[PDB]
């Protein structure tokens, strides 16, 4: 029936004709090469260097499972041509994710901003939600660092993903997101550390933030 063969390539398991008339091979290659990137992702996003790279790596697996969820769900045994047409509006999107990753690659803020410029570059198209759901979780740990100088003041660093590292007492060297708040965060923290010794509209960040800076 061959349908359980082609459908078992998007999963990665080899088959009788998938190793690692007569025109079907051309049709087979169009769904075959789709599989070669799915495997080329688990080989790349399997680990649990950088903290923000892990979250982006942890956000990617939150997506592939959906791709594994959609398959093995609808078709018990459908027509051969139905497979190629059904997995076209979705398959080409999988090949787009290869242009994003490698299959070098920035880290830290350099990556949290690179992924941002991928939004405005391809905003209105159908690639807006998937990239957004990545950026929405690829910045999750970075907000926590920012959530230190605003609430507690205990600077937290691991490998240098933060853009800021650590008489005069003011030698915490400092030198995308709106610079109107960039330099303000640098001073909104040093004050706390000193009292201890005595459309892309970024509104979800600055609104719970500026309310605390003035106070």
């Amino acid at each position: 029936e061959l349908v359980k063969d082609v459908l078992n390539v998007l999963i990665g398991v080899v088959s009788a004709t998938f190793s690692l008339p007569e025109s079907i091979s051309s049709l087979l290659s169009e769904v075959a090469e789709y599989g070669t990137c799915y495997t080329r992702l688990s080989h790349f996003s399997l680990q649990p260097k950088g903290l923000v790279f892990q979250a982006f790596t942890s956000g990617l697996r939150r997506y592939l499972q959906y791709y594994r969820a959609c398959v093995l769900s609808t078709p018990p045994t459908l027509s051969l041509l139905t497979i190629g047409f059904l997995f076209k509006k979705l398959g080409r999107q999988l090949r787009y994710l290869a242009e994003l990753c490698g299959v070098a690659f920035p880290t830290g803020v350099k990556l949290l901003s690179y992924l941002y410029q991928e939004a405005l570059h391809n905003c209105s198209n159908e690639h807006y939600p998937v990239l957004l759901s990545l950026l929405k979780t690829s910045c999750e740990p970075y907000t926590r660092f920012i959530h230190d100088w605003v609430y507690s003041g205990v600077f937290r660093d691991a490998y240098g993903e933060f853009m800021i590292q650590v008489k005069l007492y003011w030698t915490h060297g400092y030198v995308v997101f709106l610079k109107h708040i960039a330099h303000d965060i640098y001073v909104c923290g040093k004050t706390i550390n000193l009292l201890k010794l005595c459309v892309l509209m970024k509104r979800s960040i600055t609104a719970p933030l500026a309310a605390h800076i003035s106070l």
Binding site: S23, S26, E30, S79, L81, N122, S124
Partner: protein
């Protein structure tokens, strides 16, 4: 060669249905399993497929740069959907009756025979004059006053999606 034909109409040619990067789909030569004066309709039917591949070869390459151009591509994916839908309908037919002839598909696939040649040249003007910027909103509108009701209702849909970019940038700016 029945199922051989439908796959050629989807973007996968074979030995009996050769492919050329210059001309397009065409019958190779004479076969003993086909009527001597039947090859005519297949060549005419193949011209429907030759347009389809040049669509995908243009869509996949996305080639010129700009959001309006890129969003015009995805807009071109919506209009081609009934072509994907109606072609798949024949599959249920021949699996049911295996003795059908080559004449029936031409009687079924006449509507798409006319829509492509009018919309295909719309792509040619873009690849030949480098229509960059919002001017694509007029080239689609200049042919929107066409006489054919189906051709009018097709490019109408692309305009309904192509404006989806302008409205957004207009909103985020105004």
């Amino acid at each position: 060669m029945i199922h051989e034909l439908l796959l050629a109409l989807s973007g996968y040619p074979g030995s009996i249905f050769t492919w050329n990067k210059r001309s397009g789909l065409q019958v190779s030569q004479d076969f003993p399993f086909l009527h001597p004066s039947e090859t005519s309709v297949l060549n005419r039917l193949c011209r429907l497929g030759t347009d389809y591949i040049r669509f995908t070869e243009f869509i996949e390459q996305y080639t010129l740069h700009g959001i309006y151009l890129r969003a015009f591509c995805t807009g071109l994916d919506s209009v081609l959907q009934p072509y994907r839908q109606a072609l798949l309908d024949l599959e249920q037919e021949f699996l049911g009756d295996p003795h059908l002839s080559i004449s029936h598909v031409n009687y079924f696939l006449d509507q798409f025979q006319l829509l492509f040649p009018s919309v295909m040249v719309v792509v040619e003007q873009i690849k030949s004059q480098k229509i960059h910027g919002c001017q694509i909103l007029e080239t689609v509108y200049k042919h929107s006053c066409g006489g054919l009701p189906p051709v009018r209702s097709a490019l109408e849909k692309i305009l309904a999606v192509c404006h989806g970019v302008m409205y957004k940038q207009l909103s985020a700016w105004m």
